[PDB]
Amino acid sequence: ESARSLGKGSAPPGPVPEGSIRIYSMRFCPFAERTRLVLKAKGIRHEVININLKNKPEWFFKKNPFGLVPVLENSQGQLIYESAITCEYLDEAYPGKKLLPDDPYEKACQKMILELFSKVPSLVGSFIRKEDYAGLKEEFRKEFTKLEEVLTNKKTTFFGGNSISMIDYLIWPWFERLEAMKLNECVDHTPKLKLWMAAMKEDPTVSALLTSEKDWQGFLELYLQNSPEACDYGL
Amino acid sequence: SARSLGKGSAPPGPVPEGSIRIYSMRFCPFAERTRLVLKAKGIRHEVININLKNKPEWFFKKNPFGLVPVLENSQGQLIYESAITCEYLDEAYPGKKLLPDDPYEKACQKMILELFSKVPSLVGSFIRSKEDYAGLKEEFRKEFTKLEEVLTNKKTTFFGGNSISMIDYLIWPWFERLEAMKLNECVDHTPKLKLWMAAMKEDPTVSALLTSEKDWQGFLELYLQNSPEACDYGL
Ligand SMILES: *CCC(=O)N1CCC[C@@H]1c1nnc(-c2ccc(C(F)(F)F)cc2)s1
């Protein structure tokens, strides 16, 4: 199967065909879902090759010395890693609707909001891995209020305005999994952030890439056990 | 003028039209990024220094993180995070572009900036700490080797070609303090990086913003004492 992840013993991929771009991804990784949301929203011709993050092949470290996902690779052999960098690269290098505003200040704002979100993925990961949960859930609420304050001052539904933009796709994957883990109580003190979650689920690009709550919980149970079959959950 | 505003200080008035304000600190390398870009692009600006140990009560309404640098234009728009401020200035103002508009090239410099992201954390540890100086020197050498490999693979003098660009200004402030921290032996095994440093010192913008050895010495001692006069060393 083409979606099955590549582990140790897999052959490194061949050259990227011209006119297309390759993304080294993982179907349950929020950092890579950022890039795939942009690829879907911009209708970019691309191919997906999943990396078994619990059985990483050694050749993948040549694509990215951090050994991390997502990674983009065009026909010229050029490689782009870091999730936010891959998204901005796709928004610039490809035609269609711009997910990033053309105004220098409004684009600086989305990057500033991204920085307000920077602490969440780390706290989110430590909470998944002793019952100190109460402290990590409180550290969630503290970071979530910072997002709530942005929506309060902007007086809009999305973080970039009344329409969905790049910053929404950068933030959404961690709140998509929040509902799948029955952790919606962590945003009952952030009503505008909670409304934003509901508005994101109405987006065609978002709902096309949504992972069911049973698929995420099944993957996460295998991933926390470091199972080599975690990244291929659901075939 | 250069004297830092502290607690109880009056908030500054509106920024005059055609100008921009930077909330800075004379010894902060993150703020020096923005000041290097302002000088390199010939942007008329005013500098307001903030006592980072005795921060003004109003400064938190300019940046929720209470951190420097911060840009404020005549429209009252606020831009923080050093990298964001540098990209904003290069887009919002005319003159010579410091950042390449090519999506891949700009993605590379951001990827190079990510490879550099460990050095600002290590510099703060060397300044703060003990006998971990020897261990921190090895980390500097290993991180600088990552930059040495970038300059070697590009076969160029600077990180963005054979002329000085934005990524050089973003990385320089930490290499400028290497001599005052008596860490020059950390670049003895990085010839391309040594040549890069010598070329940066010859840059007119870099030369005008250099800090004497005895000023960075006194500021560090006072910062190593939690002094409200550290930011205003030398007055
Ligand atoms: C690249 C893959 C990756 O980062 N991961 C795979 C499993 C661990 C890690 C995580 N990715 N998303 C995670 C997560 C956990 C909890 C939430 C929460 F919203 F809090 F419910 C969100 C996202 S761990």
Residue with tokens 């050259």: A15
∠ CA B118-B123-B126, nearest 5°, is 125
Burial of A220 (0-12, 13-18, 19+ CB in 10 A): middle
- Out of B73, B80, B106, closest to residue A112 by CB: B80
Nearest to B80 by CA among B36, B167, B12, B21: B21
The CATH number of the domain covering residues in B20-97+212-223: 3.40.30.10
Q: How many CB atoms lie within 10 A of CB A89?
A: 24
Is A111 an interface residue toward B (CB < 8 Å)? yes
* DSSP character at residue B19: -
A128 neighbors A108 (Cβ within 8 angstroms):
no
The rounded distance, in Å, linking the Cα atoms of B234 and A169 is 47
Determination method here?
X-ray
The rounded distance, in Å, linking the Cα atoms of B98 and B41 is 8
B122 neighbors B177 (Cβ within 8 angstroms):
no
The rounded distance, in Å, linking the Cα atoms of A175 and A217 is 14
The rounded distance, in Å, linking the Cα atoms of A38 and A41 is 5
Ligand 1 — pocket residues by CB below 6 A? A 26, 28-31, 69, 124-125, 128, 174, 177-178, 181, 183, 223
Chain A, window 156-175: residues with a beta carbon less than 8 angstroms from a chain B beta carbon: none
B103 to A89: CB separation less than 8 angstroms, yes or no: yes
Give me the resolution in angstroms, 1 decimal: 2.3
Q: Where in chain A is the domain with CATH 3.40.30.10?
A: 21-98+213-224
Q: Where in chain B is the domain with CATH 3.40.30.10?
A: 20-97+212-223
Please, what is the angle between helix A133-154 and helix A191-201, to 10°? 80
Chain A, window 120-159: residues with a beta carbon less than 8 angstroms from a chain B beta carbon: 146, 149
Q: Give the distance, in angstroms, between the CA of residue A103 and the centroid of all CA atoms in the same chain.
A: 24
Would you say domain A21-98+213-224 falls under CATH 3.40.30.10? Answer: yes
The rounded distance, in Å, linking the Cα atoms of B33 and A49 is 38
Is B64 an interface residue toward A (CB < 8 Å)? yes
DSSP-H helix ranges across chain A = 30-41, 60-63, 83-93, 104-116, 120-128, 133-154, 166-180, 191-201, 204-208, 213-224
Residue B174, token pair as written in the block: 């930490």
The rounded distance, in Å, linking the Cα atoms of B39 and B155 is 28
Nearest to B81 by CA among B36, B117, B114, B34: B34
Q: Where in chain B is the domain with CATH 1.20.1050.10?
A: 103-202
Task: Please give the distance, rounded to the nearest whole angstrom, from the Cα atom of residue B199 to the centre of ligand 1.
Answer: 44
B114 to A146: CB separation less than 8 angstroms, yes or no: no
Q: Per CATH, which fold does B103-202 belong to?
A: Glutathione S-transferase Yfyf (Class Pi); Chain A, domain 2 (1.20.1050)
**DSSP reduced 3-state for A78:** coil
Residue type (1 letter), B227: S
- Out of A80, A108, A149, closest to residue B79 by CB: A108
Residue type (1 letter), A189: H
Would you say domain A104-202 falls under CATH 1.20.1050.10? Answer: yes
B28 is an active site residue: yes
* DSSP character at residue A158: S
The rounded distance, in Å, linking the Cα atoms of A78 and A134 is 44
∠ CA A228-A223-A169, nearest 5°, is 120
Residue with tokens 């590549």: A6
